[PDB]
Design a protein around this ligand. Structure first.
Ligand SMILES: [Zn+2]
Ligand SMILES: [Zn+2]
Ligand SMILES: [Zn+2]
Lengths: 33, 266, 131, 65, 46
């Protein structure tokens, strides 16, 4: 409803983009495997 | 004959092995040192890159380029670019190489030795051929790239010996070992109980006899019967490197005599 | 090799032993005041003042990412007036020298035209180095 | 990386041997002491280069144009 | 060799001058990497 706060997320976790990831995701998104 | 007799055993295109008998110790040592260090050789020195998007560095790739050995049969008629009185390089002191390798095949586009084309006018000299010693005829593994990547060079190769660098050394691991059955007492082996059983019965023990255990100790004998195993890269064959090495050693001792004639007249 | 020091074949160092690249990156900012005033990255001149040579600059005070850099080159051209043109470029590093490698021209959440420089520099294992 | 040109001690080139040795392992899978004996590095201080060397070039070239 | 500013996804040898667009076209990302050298700089293989 009303947006407050932008909490910094630890990566490879359950709001990280790269928790959805395999090799194509890592390489196309420039992430070290 | 008179002095140094040569008795060549097993040899190859790129292997020499020889009893070099009735020669002096420091003579053998000086010979292996000058054949290591003191022979001129063409290899790539100056590198001008136009564009590059490969995964390797320009400087790294240029360092490999320098480590590429070329053909150096005709070293004697190529000038140093310092003693040549031209403007920094010419076609008698320098060898220009030009290489553009582009990739579009979408599975590990490769680049090897045999891609080098000598665009410089070689004046009909046996120089600059990239030494395909390969069984399958490819060369050294130079570079790997894909579609958008590219390898664009403009290189100049020059002379020099194995003391400027290691890039002008065609010598490649020259051996020297005399007198296995040690009657000279130059070395007592480390041992717990028995050196003859603990220390292994060595390689060149076939030719000189086992040292006849029950004898008193000889003192008179010097260093004789050397068995010097040599090798090469392949920039020159293995006879011509011993030729050019003894030639340059003879030339430097002639330079000692040149300095003596410089001295005793002035 | 008295007191643990070790002795080195220089020929293998020519052959590649412990050869290494080195990657430092820089920053530069067209700064932001409180009164919405933007700054500029462009090729500076005399119009805190340095005397570094402008010889490797770009159109907008940058340096092209594939050229050998040396001495005391001006790294990122930057200008800013107040309502003059200052010497807001930053000169080279007194302690290192090498090759500029990679330049991206980006911004932040609030629009500061942000350009960067990474430097590549070869380094060979010299005598006074610790192993 | 790439196997180094002129394996540092001797300086005999071995960067020719890498693709043939690659297909020698992938094709025949022997003990590598015998495999390098077939590709002929008699001294162990140069056998170390092919027994050791790690390529990272393929994991580099997976990325992007 | 006409190449000035090349983004990652759109490898786009287009242009750029002072304050044109921080976003590149054909893809909304805005990194704007600059292209390599026109001229040639020479190095030693030592
Ligand atoms: Zn010349
Ligand atoms: Zn070696
Ligand atoms: Zn893009």
């Amino acid at each position: 409803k009303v947006f407050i706060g932008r909490l910094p997320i630890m990566l490879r976790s359950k709001n990280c983009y790269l928790s959805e990831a395999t090799e194509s995701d890592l390489y196309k998104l420039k992430e070290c495997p | 004959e008179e002095g140094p007799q040569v008795k060549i055993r097993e040899a190859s295109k790129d292997n020499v092995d020889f009893i070099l008998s009735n020669v002096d110790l420091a003579m053998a040592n000086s010979l292996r040192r000058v054949m290591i260090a003191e022979i001129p050789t063409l290899a790539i020195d100056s590198v001008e890159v136009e564009t590059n998007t490969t995964v390797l560095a320009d400087e790294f790739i240029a360092h490999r380029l320098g480590l590429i050995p070329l053909q150096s049969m005709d070293i004697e008629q190529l000038e140093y670019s310092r003693d040549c009185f031209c403007e920094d390089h010419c076609d008698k002191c320098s060898v220009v190489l030009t290489l553009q390798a582009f990739g579009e095949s979408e599975s590990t586009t490769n680049v090897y030795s045999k891609d080098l084309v000598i665009v410089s006018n070689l004046m009909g000299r046996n120089i600059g051929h990239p030494i395909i010693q390969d069984k399958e005829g490819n060369g050294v593994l130079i570079c790997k790239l894909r579609k958008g990547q590219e390898l664009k060079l403009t290189c100049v190769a020059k002379k020099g010996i194995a003391k400027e660098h290691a890039k002008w050394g065609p010598a490649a691991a020259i051996e020297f070992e005399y007198d296995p059955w040690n009657k000279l007492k130059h070395t007592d082996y480390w041992y717990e109980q028995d050196s003859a059983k603990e220390w292994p019965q060595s390689k060149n023990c076939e030719y000189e006899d086992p040292p006849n255990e029950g004898d008193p100790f000889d003192y008179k004998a010097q260093a004789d019967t050397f068995y010097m195993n040599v090798e090469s890269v392949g920039s020159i064959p293995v006879d011509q490197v011993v030729v050019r090495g003894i030639d340059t050693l003879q030339k430097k001792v002639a330079s000692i005599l040149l300095a003596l004639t410089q001295m005793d007249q002035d | 090799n008295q007191e643990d020091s070790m002795i080195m074949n220089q020929s293998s160092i020519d052959r590649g032993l412990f050869r290494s690249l080195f990657f430092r990156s820089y920053m530069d900012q067209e700064k932001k005041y409180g009164m919405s005033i933007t700054e500029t990255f462009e090729k500076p001149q005399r119009t805190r003042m340095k005397h570094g040579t402008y010889d490797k600059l770009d159109d907008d005070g940058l340096i092209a990412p594939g050229v050998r850099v040396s001495g005391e080159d001006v790294i990122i051209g930057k200008t800013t007036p107040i309502s003059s043109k200052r010497d807001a470029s930053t000169p080279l590093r007194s302690t290192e020298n090498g090759i500029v490698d990679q330049v991206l021209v980006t911004t932040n959440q609030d629009g500061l035209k942000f350009v960067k420089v990474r430097v590549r520099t070869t380094k060979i294992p010299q005598i006074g180095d610790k192993f | 990386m790439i196997v180094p040109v002129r394996c540092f001690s001797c300086g005999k080139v071995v960067g020719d041997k890498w693709e043939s040795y690659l297909n020698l392992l992938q094709e025949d899978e022997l003990d590598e002491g015998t495999a390098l004996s077939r590709l002929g590095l008699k001294r162990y201080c140069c056998r170390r280069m092919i027994l050791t060397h790690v390529d990272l070039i393929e994991k580099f070239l997976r990325y992007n144009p | 060799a006409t190449l000035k500013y090349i983004c990652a996804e759109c490898s786009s040898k287009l242009s750029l001058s002072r304050t044109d667009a921080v976003r590149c076209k054909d893809c909304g990302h805005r990194i704007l990497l600059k292209a390599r050298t026109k001229r040639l700089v020479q190095f030693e293989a030592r």
